[PDB]
Design a protein around this motif. Structure first.
Motif, short mmCIF file in Angstrom:
data_model
loop_
_atom_site.label_atom_id
_atom_site.label_comp_id
_atom_site.label_asym_id
_atom_site.label_seq_id
_atom_site.Cartn_x
_atom_site.Cartn_y
_atom_site.Cartn_z
N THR A 42 0.79 -1.23 0.00
CA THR A 42 0.00 0.00 0.00
C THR A 42 0.82 1.28 0.00
O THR A 42 0.28 2.34 -0.34
CB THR A 42 -1.00 0.03 1.17
OG1 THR A 42 -0.30 0.01 2.43
CG2 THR A 42 -1.97 -1.14 1.08
N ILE A 47 -5.29 4.87 0.32
CA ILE A 47 -5.97 3.78 1.01
C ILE A 47 -7.36 4.24 1.41
O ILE A 47 -7.55 5.36 1.90
CB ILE A 47 -5.17 3.24 2.22
CG1 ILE A 47 -4.87 4.35 3.24
CG2 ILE A 47 -3.90 2.56 1.74
CD1 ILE A 47 -4.15 3.85 4.49
N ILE A 101 -8.73 -1.11 2.09
CA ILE A 101 -8.05 -1.79 3.18
C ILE A 101 -9.02 -2.29 4.24
O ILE A 101 -8.59 -2.66 5.34
CB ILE A 101 -6.94 -0.93 3.79
CG1 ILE A 101 -7.51 0.27 4.56
CG2 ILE A 101 -5.97 -0.48 2.70
CD1 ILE A 101 -6.53 0.82 5.54
#
Ligand SMILES: NC(=O)c1ccc[n+]([C@@H]2O[C@H](COP(=O)([O-])OP(=O)(O)OC[C@H]3O[C@@H](n4cnc5c(N)ncnc54)[C@H](OP(=O)(O)O)[C@@H]3O)[C@@H](O)[C@H]2O)c1
Ligand SMILES: CCc1nc(N)nc(N)c1OCCCOc1ncccc1C#CCO
Ligand SMILES: [Cl-]
Length: 166
Positions: A42, A47, A101
């Motif tokens: 990531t 995110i 996420i």
């Protein structure tokens, strides 16, 4: 490669073999290899997380560094210091590369737009309980690569999957 004019959407999660990802407002295990993997994938990207996942992060650690943090909420008065709160995936998916996420609700919401999933599966026996957050189920439009079982320093087997679709 990700063209800068595109909007690539990936999902990344860690699950028990039962598909459980969350229980009681937390992840019901800890795995350093998974934390490292999550960061490697990531870092540098946007995110996107559900409001309940933001809540599950200790105040001192959030927003997660090195990444633009976006939180999904339908509550007009929910605020996430250091991050952006938006009410839809349309607002959250404006960057060229976005990693969703979690948690369970947001994975299910984002799945129709996703073309990649990165999964860590932990060989811990945690059967599904009422109220658990669960990994999204992947239909036959997806194709997966499953890694062999590996062994963590903390004494749990784990393996990685990478899924893709067009
Ligand atoms: N193992 C992993 O990889 C992993 C990763 C992340 C999280 N988790 C765990 O998963 C659990 C949290 O998952 P969860 O399913 O309960 O919640 P979540 O998906 O993290 O967040 C749900 C919240 O997102 C908002 N939301 C949902 N749909 C929306 C939509 N269409 N538009 C705008 N906002 C929307 C809502 O916020 P409002 O109620 O504010 O409207 C909803 O309550 C926790 O236990 C967490 O620790 C595990
Ligand atoms: C690292 C956990 C995780 N793993 C994969 N593979 N995908 C994810 N989406 C994911 O959740 C990130 C958001 C939730 O993070 C946490 N929640 C509870 C306790 C600790 C953490 C953390 C951290 C960073 O070290
Ligand atoms: Cl992190």
């Amino acid at each position: 490669l990700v063209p800068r004019g595109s909007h690539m959407v990936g999902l990344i999660w860690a699950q028990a073999t039962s598909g459980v990802i969350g229980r009681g407002g937390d992840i019901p295990w800890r795995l350093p290899e998974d934390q490292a993997h999550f960061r490697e994938i990531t870092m540098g990207h946007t995110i996107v997380m559900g409001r309940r996942t933001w809540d599950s992060l200790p105040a001192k650690v959030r927003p997660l560094p090195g990444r633009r943090n976006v939180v999904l909420s339908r509550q007009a008065d929910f605020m996430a210091s250091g991050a952006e709160v938006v009410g839809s995936l349309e607002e959250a998916l404006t960057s060229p590369e976005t990693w969703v996420i979690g948690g369970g609700q947001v994975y299910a919401l984002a799945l129709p737009y996703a073309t990649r999933c990165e999964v860590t599966e932990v060989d811990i026996g945690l059967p599904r309980e009422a109220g658990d957050a669960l990994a999204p189920v992947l239909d036959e439009t997806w194709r997966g690569e499953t890694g062999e079982w590996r062994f963590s320093r903390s004494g749990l087997r784990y393996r990685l999957y990478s899924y893709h679709r067009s």
